[PDB]
PDB file of all heavy atoms in Angstrom:
ATOM      1  N   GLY D  43      35.854   2.814 -33.283  1.00  2.00           N
ATOM      2  CA  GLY D  43      34.499   3.324 -33.329  1.00  2.00           C
ATOM      3  C   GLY D  43      33.670   3.030 -32.095  1.00  2.00           C
ATOM      4  O   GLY D  43      32.453   3.246 -32.098  1.00  2.00           O
ATOM      5  N   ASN D  44      34.305   2.538 -31.042  1.00  2.00           N
ATOM      6  CA  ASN D  44      33.620   2.249 -29.790  1.00  2.00           C
ATOM      7  C   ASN D  44      33.796   3.405 -28.818  1.00  2.00           C
ATOM      8  O   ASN D  44      34.512   4.372 -29.092  1.00  2.00           O
ATOM      9  CB  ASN D  44      34.149   0.943 -29.202  1.00  2.00           C
ATOM     10  CG  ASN D  44      35.626   1.004 -28.872  1.00  2.00           C
ATOM     11  OD1 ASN D  44      36.471   0.631 -29.685  1.00  2.00           O
ATOM     12  ND2 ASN D  44      35.943   1.470 -27.671  1.00  2.00           N
ATOM     13  N   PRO D  45      33.137   3.348 -27.658  1.00  2.00           N
ATOM     14  CA  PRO D  45      33.218   4.462 -26.703  1.00  2.00           C
ATOM     15  C   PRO D  45      34.520   4.426 -25.910  1.00  2.00           C
ATOM     16  O   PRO D  45      34.870   3.406 -25.312  1.00  2.00           O
ATOM     17  CB  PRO D  45      32.008   4.234 -25.793  1.00  2.00           C
ATOM     18  CG  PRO D  45      31.808   2.765 -25.824  1.00  2.00           C
ATOM     19  CD  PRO D  45      32.180   2.319 -27.217  1.00  2.00           C
ATOM     20  N   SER D  46      35.231   5.549 -25.907  1.00  2.00           N
ATOM     21  CA  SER D  46      36.432   5.691 -25.097  1.00  2.00           C
ATOM     22  C   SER D  46      36.060   6.078 -23.674  1.00  2.00           C
ATOM     23  O   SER D  46      35.269   6.999 -23.454  1.00  2.00           O
ATOM     24  CB  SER D  46      37.368   6.740 -25.698  1.00  2.00           C
ATOM     25  OG  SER D  46      36.790   8.031 -25.636  1.00  2.00           O
ATOM     26  N   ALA D  47      36.636   5.371 -22.705  1.00  2.00           N
ATOM     27  CA  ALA D  47      36.258   5.561 -21.312  1.00  2.00           C
ATOM     28  C   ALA D  47      36.533   6.989 -20.856  1.00  2.00           C
ATOM     29  O   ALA D  47      37.602   7.547 -21.115  1.00  2.00           O
ATOM     30  CB  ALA D  47      37.003   4.575 -20.417  1.00  2.00           C
ATOM     31  N   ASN D  48      35.554   7.573 -20.168  1.00  2.00           N
ATOM     32  CA  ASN D  48      35.619   8.929 -19.633  1.00  2.00           C
ATOM     33  C   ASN D  48      35.424   9.992 -20.703  1.00  2.00           C
ATOM     34  O   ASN D  48      35.610  11.182 -20.435  1.00  2.00           O
ATOM     35  CB  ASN D  48      36.933   9.169 -18.884  1.00  2.00           C
ATOM     36  CG  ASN D  48      36.851   8.768 -17.426  1.00  2.00           C
ATOM     37  OD1 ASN D  48      35.951   9.195 -16.704  1.00  2.00           O
ATOM     38  ND2 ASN D  48      37.792   7.943 -16.983  1.00  2.00           N
ATOM     39  N   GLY D  49      35.050   9.591 -21.918  1.00  2.00           N
ATOM     40  CA  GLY D  49      34.708  10.510 -22.971  1.00  2.00           C
ATOM     41  C   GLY D  49      33.230  10.831 -22.989  1.00  2.00           C
ATOM     42  O   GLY D  49      32.462  10.420 -22.110  1.00  2.00           O
ATOM     43  N   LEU D  50      32.820  11.582 -24.011  1.00  2.00           N
ATOM     44  CA  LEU D  50      31.417  11.966 -24.114  1.00  2.00           C
ATOM     45  C   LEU D  50      30.524  10.730 -24.154  1.00  2.00           C
ATOM     46  O   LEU D  50      29.710  10.506 -23.251  1.00  2.00           O
ATOM     47  CB  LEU D  50      31.199  12.841 -25.345  1.00  2.00           C
ATOM     48  CG  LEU D  50      31.553  14.321 -25.220  1.00  2.00           C
ATOM     49  CD1 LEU D  50      30.703  14.981 -24.158  1.00  2.00           C
ATOM     50  CD2 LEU D  50      33.025  14.498 -24.918  1.00  2.00           C
ATOM     51  N   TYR D  51      30.666   9.908 -25.191  1.00  2.00           N
ATOM     52  CA  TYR D  51      30.016   8.604 -25.193  1.00  2.00           C
ATOM     53  C   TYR D  51      30.694   7.710 -24.169  1.00  2.00           C
ATOM     54  O   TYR D  51      31.831   7.277 -24.371  1.00  2.00           O
ATOM     55  CB  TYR D  51      30.075   7.949 -26.571  1.00  2.00           C
ATOM     56  CG  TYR D  51      29.474   8.743 -27.703  1.00  2.00           C
ATOM     57  CD1 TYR D  51      30.267   9.227 -28.728  1.00  2.00           C
ATOM     58  CD2 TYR D  51      28.106   8.954 -27.780  1.00  2.00           C
ATOM     59  CE1 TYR D  51      29.723   9.929 -29.778  1.00  2.00           C
ATOM     60  CE2 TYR D  51      27.553   9.659 -28.824  1.00  2.00           C
ATOM     61  CZ  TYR D  51      28.365  10.141 -29.825  1.00  2.00           C
ATOM     62  OH  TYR D  51      27.825  10.848 -30.871  1.00  2.00           O
ATOM     63  N   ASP D  52      30.004   7.435 -23.071  1.00  2.00           N
ATOM     64  CA  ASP D  52      30.535   6.573 -22.029  1.00  2.00           C
ATOM     65  C   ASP D  52      29.506   5.497 -21.719  1.00  2.00           C
ATOM     66  O   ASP D  52      28.361   5.552 -22.174  1.00  2.00           O
ATOM     67  CB  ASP D  52      30.892   7.375 -20.775  1.00  2.00           C
ATOM     68  CG  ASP D  52      31.805   6.619 -19.843  1.00  2.00           C
ATOM     69  OD1 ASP D  52      33.008   6.512 -20.152  1.00  2.00           O
ATOM     70  OD2 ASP D  52      31.319   6.133 -18.799  1.00  2.00           O
ATOM     71  N   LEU D  53      29.925   4.504 -20.941  1.00  2.00           N
ATOM     72  CA  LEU D  53      29.037   3.424 -20.540  1.00  2.00           C
ATOM     73  C   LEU D  53      28.399   3.651 -19.179  1.00  2.00           C
ATOM     74  O   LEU D  53      27.571   2.839 -18.757  1.00  2.00           O
ATOM     75  CB  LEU D  53      29.786   2.089 -20.539  1.00  2.00           C
ATOM     76  CG  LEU D  53      29.804   1.339 -21.869  1.00  2.00           C
ATOM     77  CD1 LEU D  53      28.400   0.897 -22.232  1.00  2.00           C
ATOM     78  CD2 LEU D  53      30.383   2.210 -22.967  1.00  2.00           C
ATOM     79  N   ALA D  54      28.562   4.851 -18.625  1.00  2.00           N
ATOM     80  CA  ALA D  54      27.827   5.183 -17.381  1.00  2.00           C
ATOM     81  C   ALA D  54      26.743   6.172 -17.757  1.00  2.00           C
ATOM     82  O   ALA D  54      25.765   6.255 -17.025  1.00  2.00           O
ATOM     83  CB  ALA D  54      28.727   5.755 -16.341  1.00  2.00           C
ATOM     84  N   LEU D  55      26.895   6.833 -18.901  1.00  2.00           N
ATOM     85  CA  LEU D  55      25.918   7.820 -19.402  1.00  2.00           C
ATOM     86  C   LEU D  55      24.892   7.019 -20.190  1.00  2.00           C
ATOM     87  O   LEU D  55      24.095   7.624 -20.903  1.00  2.00           O
ATOM     88  CB  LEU D  55      26.648   8.815 -20.299  1.00  2.00           C
ATOM     89  CG  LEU D  55      27.184  10.077 -19.636  1.00  2.00           C
ATOM     90  CD1 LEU D  55      28.072   9.746 -18.454  1.00  2.00           C
ATOM     91  CD2 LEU D  55      27.961  10.887 -20.648  1.00  2.00           C
ATOM     92  N   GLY D  56      24.961   5.694 -20.109  1.00  2.00           N
ATOM     93  CA  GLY D  56      23.958   4.827 -20.748  1.00  2.00           C
ATOM     94  C   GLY D  56      24.483   4.109 -21.966  1.00  2.00           C
ATOM     95  O   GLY D  56      25.413   4.610 -22.585  1.00  2.00           O
ATOM     96  N   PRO D  57      23.878   2.981 -22.375  1.00  2.00           N
ATOM     97  CA  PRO D  57      24.282   2.322 -23.584  1.00  2.00           C
ATOM     98  C   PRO D  57      23.692   3.149 -24.717  1.00  2.00           C
ATOM     99  O   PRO D  57      22.518   3.298 -24.741  1.00  2.00           O
ATOM    100  CB  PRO D  57      23.440   1.054 -23.561  1.00  2.00           C
ATOM    101  CG  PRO D  57      23.020   0.882 -22.134  1.00  2.00           C
ATOM    102  CD  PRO D  57      22.801   2.299 -21.671  1.00  2.00           C
TER     103      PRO D  57
END
Side-chain angles (χ1 to χ4, degrees):
Chain D
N44 62 267
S46 66
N48 272 307
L50 279 298
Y51 303 114
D52 197 75
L53 272 294
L55 268 54

